[PDB]
Ligand binder design. Structure first.
Ligand code: HEM
Lengths: 499, 499, 499, 499
């Protein structure tokens, strides 16, 4: 007897023993008479096109694959619910927060960032932690990571950052000179790079890590009053990490470690859960905040902005068909119910467009009619019609133009947005020189102990040693700009690694 | 008060008078507060990305269109049922003929051939008359025309023929030189051409024309015995045609004449219905038949192969959304249930590959998961998985391979195909010289009368006159090869049209 | 002999009389030995899969079609050059205006609006008139119509308007109730509706109509000084229209009238040409302008803003292949070279997204690598990589991220945008009741004469009569609000039409 | 200084030091003035739509990915030439074998089978060895593996075999039960499984393994005479293998080991090469051969059918952009020049369809117009037109139908296929019980030595122990059917592994 994942088929049969097997058909419902031998003219003769049983099956086999996600391609998924435990109705009128005890169906997808579909799970990388809330106001996607910050703060650098984290365009190899040339030319990355080369850069699966919206968002209550917030969801199973040596063994021992962990957990009843907190900032506090409160490379410290609890995320169901329910999951930061809205965070302003854009490419123009993506607890009605692979009644014979004298859907004025005043030149403002070291200094000195600082440097040096010396020299300098002992330790190790 | 088609929105509003209008939402189910005005900075300022209401609506509008059909693009649709009235179980075991009184749902498409989506209905053309039977053993797609025959008899000429009947690739205009250079270089077209330019070239809407499967097909009964057959469905409303004069007036007074006629008939309860017949040829009649009995340019004469009634087709329901239910309809001649099998007709052997093929391009790899296309009266079960726009549970966690020791679906030996014996070289055989005139001579002399022959010639000369002289000279010789006076009449009228 | 279009194939053969015909191949370059007869076992036997010549040719015929344009689907194309004849470098620094005498290649596509691929040319509808300039600074797409104004002034209403002008979702029939329910609930349409039912609603081919940029745009000279502008290109062949009586004859006698008139002109050396003008409005004239200067239902009167000439548009070359050079044409308003920039027109702003969006769907992710869409007089170099159907070297092994230390492309600071100050609430501002009648009154009284006013009203009532009475009454009211005699005339004609 | 692969960017900058960096443009050729900061309203404001520099680049990033190969996804590419060295023109007329010394440009792709794009290179799996010859008669794709044989012999079992070799449809994990349930239910796989689990299951990269075409193919000479042949291309660098211990270290130390080993070799002039041999079986010897000569699970022994040399394959060029030259590479077995034809092999017959079919999905309808797929040594001319992403003239204004009297391409009769006689019932013949053991027994006893048999069983037991007991027992039985001591040794080690 083995773990539950290995016994998948065994249980599919047992859960079925009472029935007779189904009749094996074509895609058109036509029963198949023999599907092990091809129609040929004679035992050693050629194949006929009259063999449409072969063409039907092969034709579909040939179209099985769709594009993998451009980022966060290697993923695990699970489904559960969100349950409200505390009252934050003064801040948000979102129905998903309406009363204590309110449950809402969720779907979660964990991921790495850089590796493709066949890569290993226990590698150094940020982790995705995307959560979709099926509310009565339409879906709410909270596309968060295992970290509160990112490496950049303008969306126009993002394709570049990703390119520098993936394969060299000629050799198709991971290229340290690309990784570090970028990071050293963009020191705003220093904060998240210090998180990444810490211990938490390799979590022991998906259940022992925290999630964060990382972005500043906006909450609007019933009076029309607004505050800015951060979301934190913290692991009730406790932070737990793999060491470098153990992560490396599992990388070839079990490439799908974090997939198998999550599936087995839920199957054995160990339902992982997370505690949803927010931080709140008023509009006033936002004007006096020392840094840019919409700079994704900055946290809101806890002492000044403590955590307010909201509710629990619980995962208690495994997917049944991985493709249908995880590969085809699509999270849009732009899916926001009334009560939740976006900040002016440059990076989040780019994500408002990019996600729906790529989903119409990766999955298709009507990807929101796929079941896991459908807002199935909301009544979807508008003037949008047709498109490839239209799957409902296409809203029937309703008038498809607005306004109209024939009683099709109407706009709901109470769902209008919060009005904010802005003034300034319409212009590309340079955010490369916002504070890039202060919060990092704090992390290095007051969050890490001495042993962790030591490991931080060894993990950095073990990867940076493969870059050229002019890149090393520049990266080390950025590290000295945080703390001279941060830089001179790294440089002591590189001096050895360089023989 | 007007015809019922014009009152569609009027009635749509009346059937809703009681309830309230729906909440107008995004495709994500998020209610919109205002959808007549965009999100801008100040009344005369620029448009914001934050306006995800606009993006969501505009983006879908931008994706409304799919590739029209490559032929038969102008279409009208309706729905109904097939009812058995006579017993032909001695020839076929197809569940759709199981017993008298048995109904099966059907869906029909009427079309022209050459015109694109906006072309007129009342033009000289063949008419598609495609019928989809939703049976228990999967779907059965009788994809016929309003002719028993076609212009050619080898599929390799089909892309060519169609190119010649569409727009010149530089000027994008209808070209008579193309049209008649082909027809006169392939005189196998004489038989169908004669049909086209007579009175039935322009039927008075789709309810006053017959439908034929034109190919020879194979029926198989419960003992394993097989016969060949032809399908005829004859209009119970009576053949009725339009004059060249009236067809040309309506071509600009109502380009959608046939579409309108069908909708209004059904809406006022005047339901159209056809009578399905079959002809039956034994295998040993097929060896002694004077022509090639699988020649798609040949009919089976009635005197020797009389019509055997089978039942009624009845259209009694209009589509609710034309796009979802008519435009996305996909018919595959290779959708054949046990009891119905292909002949060796070279032209039908091509259509077994072409239709599924083009449907994966026009509609999508999983187009059979579109409702109106679905085999909703059978159980689809097999080892096909994934593909873009997967719309069911993707078959669940069922074992995806075959054979297996876990009781996934099994093959049904009774559904094997009938086995024929064939012997001969594997090579390309020349069919350009099968009897191209005999059955036409009969049509011209014995079926048509004096006035119809006169009109047949006028209609041909009135379109052949715009081709070059060397092309007219050749066409006329092919016509002369049917009957001297056939050519003589056309050539006398051409001598006049050429001033 | 016949017109030059009809003789296209004749001339192709003549231009090749001297050579031998090419060898006919598969798409893989494998010569074909027979393509009229299919590979079969015996003369009357089944088709084989081994017949890759059939499948290679049938596979591509099955994928011949692409989605037609969602609007303006029916179009005609030609190519030529733009030439500067006057100096407007004090307003715009764009390299297409640099000096008198400079020539830039162009590509033009004329079109109707609503009719699909097969509809008639000679119908009442606006006419598209899009102009692609191939600049050294990249492409410039002046996507114009044959009117200065449009029916609506907010992009959100654009799907609706179109839906109302196209087919009823259930009957697939042009619906008068949809047309006028919309127009009568949105009286901003009054201006362009009076343009459309006037003599210029049906132009006599594409050479006898003007072209307008319609939108206000922004020009920026070398000093950084900016003005607002309007592009008018006026036919050098003279305004010429068709009467309702003749347009309806041709609509069935020659559906492709405009397409034939443009090819035949060019082929016979009668090259059509236009004269490009601008209006100019300083930022300070924009502030005092009585209406909203960015309202697309409004014109700038000539007395206050006279026409300034710029150059000539000349069309002097037909397409060689219509699909590759016309059907696949893609104009993006957003393609704007330094010195030409958008105004805050709500409609234009919307079009900045729409066109690239739909072109990725209609043509594909890399649609700008199609030769006719290529900026083949600039040097494209950036950090975009891959995609479906990637056709060049994909920019080689160049570093693919930015910034980088390995000398891949750099930004050009002189090509930054003009900076404008905006201030206001971010909200949805209601423009429904900007002045809707003033400039229409002027048109009805001062531009048309007695006869033309008569025909304008007969054309409006000849179409509005089919709508319901409550829709009629409302429209007429909207027409009275322009002038009592406007709506009263229409109402007198409607009274007769309603028997 | 480092290896060449890591100095890629270093050498790109050096090879450019003379010139100045290009101007960074949009896709449309428009220079950008700042691509590090986004267009906003005030420094902490929201993002505008008229930031088309952002949109244009993100929209393409969002569409960088295409579908991965449905098998053999992980790959490494190189280009070179094929040079004839011996005269086989008595067997084949193919222009690639015309004379000694004749060179042809080639392109080769190496791969594994079951891992996705991200997986490691040093795992136990077959290896792809696909060769594209660009001959004057079009392209010749020889789609070969590093084995003479394969696991199955009917293509209707392919999708299933591949499903079992990949991931569980619910857990997304590698599932030994699926692996061995399939293999133990289809003992035909015994031959190739004993190859897979010997030392050659893991090659030391791609330069130290042989190539084979596995399938019997047909050769046809200038006289029309045919023979059946096998292609073997052996490594001039020598067979060399990784041990299980080192293959696993490298699977985490360098996932891309085989890719780097090829690139560094070519870059340093150590060009790998292969020797091309054929075996030859006359049609007479094919009637008396002891097994089925077209049984993909059978080799032709060397004693009876010796290797006949042909020429060399040499890889002396790396790719410059991996995506454009290696990921978009498409190989079709059906690309076969005159002189080379398929044999009736049931598995090859299915590859004649499957590959073009998946290539139209994976890449697109016109994937043969992608440079590296272009038959650029041959002249493509025919009657195929249009399609998504049509990239050349589209063959201009040339007549698009055949036959025609206007001098478009003609068929070449000498390119016709060899005619073979076939006689037999058209049915599905069982091939499950062709001799499944005999050649395996020879391998085990006569090809392997003592040590190698021991490791063969250890490799097998290490993997089979994770399957259920009932699957183990059945697999061992199939190994006892080869040789009692084969099944014995495996059962003694499974007894230990099961504690
Ligand atoms: C402007 C900056 C960014 C851009 C342009 C961007 C772009 C993308 C794209 C195109 C995808 C693919 C989505 C799909 O295929 O369905 C994706 C996935 C994802 N992104 Fe980002 N991203 C950005 C920053 C971020 C940030 C700040 C976070 C978290 C705070 C994040 C978290 C994720 C996650 C978790 C996924 C995987 C979603 C899934 O499992 O389907 N990304 N991103």
């Amino acid at each position: 007897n083995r773990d539950p994942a290995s016994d998948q088929m065994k249980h599919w049969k047992e859960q079925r023993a009472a029935q007779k097997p189904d009749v094996l058909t074509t895609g058109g419902g036509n029963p198949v008479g023999d599907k092990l031998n091809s129609l040929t003219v004679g035992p050693r003769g050629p194949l006929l096109v009259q063999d449409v049983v072969f063409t039907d099956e092969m034709a579909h086999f040939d179209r099985e694959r769709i594009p993998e996600r451009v980022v966060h391609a290697k993923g695990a998924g699970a489904f559960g619910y969100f349950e409200v435990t505390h009252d934050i109705t003064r801040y948000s009128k979102a129905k998903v927060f309406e009363h204590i005890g309110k449950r809402t169906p969720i779907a979660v997808r964990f991921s790495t960032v850089a590796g493709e579909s066949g890569s290993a799970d226990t590698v150094r990388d940020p982790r995705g932690f995307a959560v979709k809330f099926y509310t009565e106001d339409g879906n709410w996607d909270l596309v968060g990571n295992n970290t509160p910050i990112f490496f950049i703060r303008d969306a126009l650098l993002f394709p570049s950052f990703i390119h520098s984290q993936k394969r060299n365009p000629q050799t198709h190899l991971k290229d340290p000179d690309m990784v570090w040339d970028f990071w050293s030319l963009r020191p705003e990355s220093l904060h998240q790079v210090s998180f990444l080369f810490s211990d938490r850069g390799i979590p022991d699966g998906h259940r022992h890590m925290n999630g964060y919206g990382s972005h500043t968002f906006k909450l609007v209550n019933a009076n029309g009053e607004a505050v800015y917030c951060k979301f934190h969801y913290k692991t009730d199973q406790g932070i737990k990490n793999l060491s470098v040596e153990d992560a490396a063994r599992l990388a070839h021992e079990d490439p799908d470690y974090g997939l198998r962990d999550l599936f087995n957990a839920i199957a054995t009843g160990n339902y992982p859960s997370w505690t949803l907190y927010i931080q709140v900032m008023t509009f006033s506090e936002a004007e006096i905040f020392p840094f840019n409160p919409f700079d994704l490379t900055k946290v809101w410290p806890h002492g000044d902005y403590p955590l307010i609890p909201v509710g629990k995320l619980v995962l208690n169901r495994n997917p049944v068909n991985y493709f249908a329910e995880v590969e085809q999951l699509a999270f849009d930061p732009s899916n926001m119910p009334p009560g939740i809205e976006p900040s002016p965070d440059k990076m989040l302003q780019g994500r408002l467009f990019a996600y729906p854009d790529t989903h119409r490419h990766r999955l298709g123009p009507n990807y929101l009619q796929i079941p896991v993506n459908c807002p199935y607890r909301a009544r979807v009605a508008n003037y949008q019609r047709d498109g490839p692979m239209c799957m409902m009644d296409n809203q029937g014979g309703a008038p498809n133009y607005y306004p109209n004298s024939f009683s099709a859907p109407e706009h709901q004025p109470s769902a209008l947005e919060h009005r904010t005043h802005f003034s300034g030149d319409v212009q590309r403002f340079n955010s490369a020189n916002d504070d890039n070291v202060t919060q990092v200094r704090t992390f290095y000195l007051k969050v890490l102990n001495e042993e962790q600082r030591k490991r931080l440097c060894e993990n950095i040096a073990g990867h940076l040693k493969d870059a050229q010396l002019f890149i090393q020299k520049k990266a080390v300098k950025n590290f000295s700009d945080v703390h001279p002992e941060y830089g001179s330790r790294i440089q002591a190790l590189l001096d050895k690694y360089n023989e």
